[PDB]
């Protein structure tokens, strides 16, 4: 079956990815690992545990990982007295204490103890934990089935004209990940900007009528608030769960093989995922990387809705 | 009329741009200036003069310019056609000084610069005489690409040859239209286009058809193209009729420090199209294929 | 008593540092950790264990660390089938097996389990293991007493006009190390180029008349061979043991406090340790880094000779 | 004797270099050219003309050059002295064109370029007319530092203002002497030096002493100096008498991509000194303090 480690930084988008992974029976979520850099490790680790608590999934391990980028300095806003959890919603306090041990060591021990070719890594934050794991244990690379990450963009940027937040937070770590010989699917902004939270989608979620569906709808209210000054969007996109959607059903997220590398020296282009789209599509044999292109909007939202129904 | 200086490096594409500029009555070609870097200054200067001779445009000045990029090292008569020997001698003086003297002696807002090679002469002119910038009506250059590269995944040849010079040009306060690969890759030399050109039945139409044979040869191993694109004349096509080359305003800057992204024209396409007041740069987007080829064919017919 | 972890890549220079650390009673060698990048991890790990065996230090743990730089690609010469050990000398086969576990995790566990302010890190290879340890456990940084590394050069380069080998192999890892708030002594080429293996020094070593003194003299024969085409040297320098010499007696290795950072983006200047020598020497309070300047030649060689005598 | 073009940005240091060039009979000052970037072109051009007026050198041409760096953005009387209004009008024409025309019209191997500001005019001249390079006898510039920086830990102001232009200059095949901070930091304006200048007792010696008062003020918070250094005139001192400014041949290039090291003149001092045949660049090392100040004092006396 599809057996995953979800490496994330919740994050309202990551919370939606957690719900999809838990609610779909074709996904075996081995555990959650967290990474600081976009926001503080402490904040996102709490949010991951509280989200899992909300879904009665406290039997899923959570391990905290790296709190800053490999090389460049940490750039997160100062912690606020009177902020816990995810903005705009309420989550129960986690009943299980955080599992002990660094996420990087847990990722390594897990991959080395399971059969080769069975674990899929699903990074939806900066790539720091993944890069660190690779360097600490190079033998994980050939053992991993696939890496399906939310990050980048071949013709679209958000943080800059050409670069995306997860990659730019730790471009060096991204460079490591993209230059290892493992199969990678880059679920970038080109794809995720199609995953629009339209009124009709949200109404179908609202109608489920459970605490979890109300939670998911609350996440979508936050996306709308976050995107309120962004005139490219009437309705906001949701990013991270598109990775899990791809793994559930490849037809939901079309892909195109191409070389992809990360720019780590440029002024204007720092953090760009440079996709070489010249010439015809190379074979999987010749090209270990592929970019996500076209979303099946209708099937994507059906996956979300079905997962929320299954969780009850 | 639009009055132009064509700064170029012929180059079979540039030769087609020269023919379009001469053959269309809405273009007043003030003169040709040449730039080395993509190919040798000596080769392209000869080719420019000989192309003008082929079109009986012996009244058009040619001045040779810079022979290498501003900063990076130099890394370097048209194949497949025959050109008459020029009857007009090469005009004396550096192209950079001629561009400057011409812009300073003509009324402000009347001259449009049309660079179709590396941007070295334009950047050098700007630095040697900063007063040219507000006097120039527009710069319409063949170069770059917002979502398409050829030399690399993200960068185009004219820009990458001299990224520093391109940086200078894009960061001056003058109106710029970037006619990049996104646009020019639509200007396809189909069998039907070439057959219409062949039917004109003159030495010049045979010359143009020869240029098109070269494009095909240059692109023969490029599987993105059944038929080859033609680049440089799209700049002149835009100036003849804006409807032929649609544009989208956006900030554009040139990457000069990146490993992978060297020479990239970085176009900020986030948010809505800003106004001309707020944004001096625009990228070429959509070609009117039918009208574009009609301009070329009509120019070739007009030249007789 | 200075208690050290020697992180190294033997390397004939590192072998001399091991002998000095073992032979001087003011040094407590907690263990040896190894790093690949300058040469292969497998080669230098064997060499470290065999050197320890030669010096009857079978009680000293060895842990193998990272086999390549953090970010940039591995650039080490192709292996030769009739090479084991250190060129030009013979070492006994190690009787103690390689200790299990990654050096990075061992460095972390050791620093976290010992009292704060007691362990001094002594890196004499690329800085990869040290940088990795810092990122995997940020709590080690304030606990470390001092870092005394062989690397860099403020006004002298060897690999380039301005940069030194250990730093250039992994400039990113060096950047990490130099930008943490721990006290650093940079024992660079400015210093080590004074540690000259003159005929008189080597004759005094030869006269000790033991297997170990012959081994040390053999290391010095290799230095001479390595430097044979280098016209800046009549006699070759020895590098790595100058770190241990500084720790034994500060008067042997004078130092000057100054800001030091590592250039990781330059064309010509890649791997340069940029020392700001403008203005007067700042206080230890204000400046955590210092560069080694002047060697006491006579005292340095006395330390080496005395250590070799003590080992018998 | 040595025939020079002094390309400068006065600047109190440059003013001292002008006085030395004029006052020493082994120097033939062909003319002065000015460059903006460290300070504004308008300010330094006026200051150059007024300094020449102060020294009764109204026969010396001044041409204004570039007002900003080649690529990077512009970031910009003489304080503490009084200068007469220039009686000679600014000579017409851009300095870059004047430098080119002068080098091309004089016999090869006779003109020495002496840049004491950013290298923008020199780089621009080289690119506009590559034939100047082999014709120039030598370039002796004030800039850089092999083991000393001032603007940064490793870089010096003139180079960092326009690192690209410096890169151009250092990578042409002409003989270069880099008179950097390693050298100029020895040219100390001690009380005894200044007392000897004061004793000359003329308007010009008072002017020179005023320049020295400014150096002291500029360096008042710099604890590496009890007495301030003077920079630019060390270039002219080298040309008067090589024994005053010792040199060491070595490869020198300019870092234009680094974060920390931007503008560094990277001198490769590994191995023995290569021959003049093999190595076109050399760095200034040791100043003869006593002889240097005697040259300055003698020049001031000669000017009356
Ligand atoms: Ca996320
Ligand atoms: Ca062209
Ligand atoms: Ca070593
Ligand atoms: Ca100056
Ligand atoms: Cl439904
Ligand atoms: Cl397929
Ligand atoms: Cl074909
Ligand atoms: Cl419009
Ligand atoms: Cl404790
Ligand atoms: Cl002895
Ligand atoms: Cl002290
Ligand atoms: Cl600058
Ligand atoms: Cl003072």
Cα distance between the two ends of chain A: 23
B34 DSSP 8-state letter:
E
Which chains reach chain C with 3 or more Cβ–Cβ distances below 8 angstroms?
Answer: A, D
Ligand positioned closest to the Cα atom of C37: 3
Angle, to 10 degrees, between the axis of helix C12-23 and the axis of helix C297-311?
70
A279 φ/ψ sector (left φ>0, alpha ψ -120 to 50, else beta): left
Helix (H) or strand (E) holding C28: strand C27-34
Number of helices (H) and strands (E) in chain C: give both, helices first.
12, 10
Decide if D11 contacts D117 (C-beta within 8 A).
yes
Name all chains with 3 or more CB-CB pairs below 8 Å to chain B.
A, D
Contact C205, C217 (CB under 8 A): yes
Let me know: does C141 contact C184? Beta carbons within 8 Å.
Answer: no
Give the resolution to one decimal, in Å.
2.0
Torsional class of D96: left (φ above 0), alpha (ψ -120 to 50), beta (otherwise):
alpha
Helix (H, G, I), strand (E, B) or coil at D134: helix
Residue found under tokens 């950072």: C261
Tell how many helices (H) and how many strands (E) occur in chain B: 12, 10
Which helix (H) or strand (E) covers residue B216, if one does? Answer: helix B203-218
Return the ligand number nearest the Cα of A165: 1
* 3-class DSSP assignment, residue D57: coil
The radius of gyration of chain B from alpha carbons, rounded to an integer in Å, stands at: 18
| Ligand closest to CA B8 | 2
Query: What distance in Å separates the CA atoms of residue A117 and residue C35, rounded to the nearest whole number?
Result: 29
Residue position matching structure tokens 């937070």: A169
Minimal CA–CA distance to D59: which of D37, D87, D21, D26? Answer: D87
- The dihedrals phi and psi of D188, each to the nearest 5 degrees, come to -85, 135
Do residues D165 and D193 lie in contact, with contact meaning Cβ atoms separated by under 8 Å?
Answer: no
DSSP state, residue D221:
T
Give the pairing of strands B111-115 and D27-34: unpaired
Give CA–CA dist D103/D122, Å, rounded.
12
Using the CB atoms, write b or e for C17-51: b if 16+ within 10 Å.
bbbbbbbbeebebbbbbbbbbbbbbebbbbbbbbb
For B229, which DSSP code? B
Query: Which residues lie below 8 Å from residue A245, measured CB to CB, with a gap of 6+?
Result: A20, A252, A253, A300, A303
Strand partners, C2: C27
DSSP character at residue A311? H
* Rg, Å, chain D Cα set: 18
Chains that touch A (3 or more CB pairs under 8 A): B, C
**C-alpha C128 – ligand 3 centre gap (Å):** 13
Residue C131: which of C163, C154, C108, C157 has the closest Cα? C108
- Phi, psi (rounded to 5 degrees) for C84: -140, 150
Instruction: Report the 10 Å Cβ neighbour count for C145.
Output: 17
Quote the CA–CA distance of A47 and D289 in Å, as a whole number: 70
Helices C12-23 and C211-226, interaxial angle, to 10°?
A: 150
Contact between C154 and C276 under an 8 Å Cβ cutoff? The reply is no
DSSP character for C77?
A: P
Q: Which residue of C has its CA nearest to A174?
A: C71
C263: nearest CA partner in chain D: D260
DSSP D255: -
Residue of D nearest to C229 (CA): D271
Residue C186 sits at the vertex; the CA angle it makes with C185 and C187, to the nearest 5 degrees, is: 110
Q: Which domains does chain B have, with CATH numbers?
A: 1-304 (3.90.245.10)
Contact B256 D71 (CB under 8 A): yes
Q: Show which residues on chain D lie within 8 Å of chain B, measured between beta carbons.
A: 66-68, 70-71, 94, 96-97, 124, 127-130, 164, 167-168, 256-257
Query: Is residue C239 flagged as an active site residue?
Result: yes
Q: Are strands D62-64 and A119-123 parallel, antiparallel or unpaired?
A: unpaired
Cα gap B10→A299, rounded to integer Å: 53
Query: Which residue from B153, B269, B149 is spatially nearest to A261, judged by alpha carbons?
Result: B153
- From residue D246, alpha-carbon distances to D139, D146, D231, D276, D287 in Å are 16, 14, 15, 15, 7
Nearest residue of A to residue C66, measured between CA atoms: A136
Of B65, B173, B168, B167, the C-alpha closest to B121 is B65
Task: Take residue A1 and report the two structure tokens written for it.
Answer: 């079956």
Contact between C255 and C187 under an 8 Å Cβ cutoff? The reply is no
Q: Which residues contact C91 (CB under 8 A, 6 or more apart)?
A: C47, C50, C51, C53, C54, C85, C215
Concatenated DSSP letters of chain B: -EEEEEEE--SHHHHHHHHHHHH-TTEEEEEEEE--SSS-HHHHHHHHHHHHHHTT-TTS-EEE--SS-SSSPP----TTS--PPPSSPPPSS-HHHHHHHHHHHSPTT-EEEEE-S-SHHHHHHHHH-TTHHHH--EEEEE---SS--SSSSS--HHHHHSHHHHHHHHTSSS-EEEE-HHHHTT-B--HHHHHHHHHH-SHHHHHHHHHHHHHHHHTTT-TT-SS-B--THHHHHHHH-GGGEEEEE--EEE--S-STTTT-EEE---SSPPPTTT--EEEEEEE-HHHHHHHHHHHHHHH-
CA angle B93, B94, B97 (to 5 degrees): 100
Distance D118 CA to ligand 4 centre (A): 8
Residues D255, C261: C-beta atoms closer than 8 Å: no
Q: Which of C68, C139, C62, C148 is nearest to C108 (CA)?
A: C139
- The alpha carbon of residue C172 is apart from the nearest alpha carbon of chain D, in Å, by 13
Q: Which of B33, B70, B124, B171 to mutate to test the interface with D (most CBs of D within 10 A)?
A: B70
Q: Which of B196, B166, B134, B177 is nearest to B38 (CA)?
A: B166
Q: In terms of DSSP bridges, do strands A119-123 and A62-64 run parallel, antiparallel, or are they unpaired?
A: unpaired
Query: Which two three-digit tokens encode residue A238?
Result: 């949701």
How close is the Cα of A39 to the center of ligand 1, in Å? 9
User: Looking up tokens 């390309």, which residue turns up?
Assistant: D7
Q: How far, in Å, is the centroid of ligand 10 from the Cα of C291?
A: 30
């Amino acid at each position: 079956m599809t057996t995953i480690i979800l490496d994330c930084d919740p994050g309202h988008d990551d919370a939606m990815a957690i719900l999809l992974a838990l609610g779909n029976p074709n996904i075996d979520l081995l555990g959650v690992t967290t990474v600081g850099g976009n926001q503080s490790l402490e904040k996102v680790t709490y949010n991951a545990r509280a989200t899992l608590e909300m879904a009665h999934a406290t039997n899923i391990p959570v391990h905290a990982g790296c709190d800053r980028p490999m090389i460049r300095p940490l750039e997160v806003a100062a912690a606020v007295h009177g902020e816990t959890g995810l903005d705009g919603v309420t989550l129960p306090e986690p009943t299980r204490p955080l599992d002990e041990g660094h996420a990087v060591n847990w990722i390594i021990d897990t991959i080395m103890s399971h059969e080769p070719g069975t674990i899929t890594l699903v990074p939806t934050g900066p790539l720091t934990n993944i890069a660190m794991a690779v360097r600490l244990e190079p033998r994980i690379v050939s053992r991993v089935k696939e890496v399906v990450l939310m990050g980048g963009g071949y013709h679209v940027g958000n943080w800059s004209a050409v670069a995306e937040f997860n990659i730019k937070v730790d471009p060096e770590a991204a460079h490591v990940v993209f230059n290892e010989d493992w199969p990678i699917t880059m679920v970038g902004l080109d794809l995720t900007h199609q995953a629009l939270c339209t009124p009709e989608v949200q109404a179908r979620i609202d109608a489920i009528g459970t605490p979890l569906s109300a939670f998911a709808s609350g996440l979508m209210d936050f996306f709308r608030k976050a995107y309120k000054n962004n005139q490219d969007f009437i309705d906001p996109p949701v990013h991270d769960p598109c990775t899990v959607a791809y793994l559930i059903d490849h037809s939901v997220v079309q892909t195109r093989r191409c070389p992809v590398d990360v720019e780590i020296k440029g002024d204007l282009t720092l953090g760009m995922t440079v996709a070489d789209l010249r010439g015809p599509e190379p074979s999987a044999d010749k090209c270990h990387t592929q970019v996500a292109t076209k979303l099946d909007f209708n099937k994507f939202w059906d996956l979300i809705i079905d997962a929320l129904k299954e969780l009850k």
